Design a binder for this molecule. Sequence first.
Ligand SMILES: Nc1csc(N2CCCCC2)n1
Lengths: 12, 252
Amino acid sequence: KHKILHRLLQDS
Amino acid sequence: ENLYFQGASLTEIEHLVQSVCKSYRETCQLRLEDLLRQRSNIFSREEVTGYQRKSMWEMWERCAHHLTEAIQYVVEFAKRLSGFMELCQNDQIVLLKAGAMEVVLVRMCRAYNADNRTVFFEGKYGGMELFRALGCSELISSIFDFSHSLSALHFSEDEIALYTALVLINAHRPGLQEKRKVEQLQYNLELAFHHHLCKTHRQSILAKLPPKGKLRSLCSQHVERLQIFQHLHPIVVQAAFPPLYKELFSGG
Ligand SMILES: Nc1csc(N2CCCCC2)n1
């Protein structure tokens, strides 16, 4: 199972 | 928290119009001019055969990777979108999981040439025969027919910008915690979009736009054909498919 969306949304 | 979560004035609606058209321009992946400046660089019969000769798993990998890259710009558009970042993380994920593919399918009509029925794929323009090795002919003709329909509307970048914000900001997505907060943002973007169509004398395309069931059917067909490929090549998905793609279309 993966969770890359949480990272993309946080990464600024 | 955010202005667009309450009733906005005509002035505020005007700033939302420029905000959305701005956020879109910064995240469009390819400029419209670059895409129109290639309509003549078509794949040769030899190159088309080359794609057709590729295995099913290789064709799926190439396509999943291209889908993932296009989705990544859609995530950026979402982040730069007015009000999206003021929503909770649950709702941000809900909206992106349901809306990302639908945005890519809309954005895609720019990369499609209605004159020769070709799409800009890997550097050149090729017809739907290029994707014959995928083994999902109904899905490919459905995605081409949809882009052919949107191409007939003669969208401006601003219109694509405004409409793609609406496709994403959908208060009817199952699993939304702050449903009323998404309802107000959707209303303000509907106002923003309809204001521009009014101001540009383009309100006639409103009746010519596709139903929300059409974007759903295409997304569901994609998940269906992915489940079929996954059953045939489980390791290819597990080992060679991008994690963002798996997260959006296989739930991990
Ligand atoms: N994963 C997946 C399934 S269909 C697809 N497309 C087909 C149209 C061109 C880009 C890639 N990707």
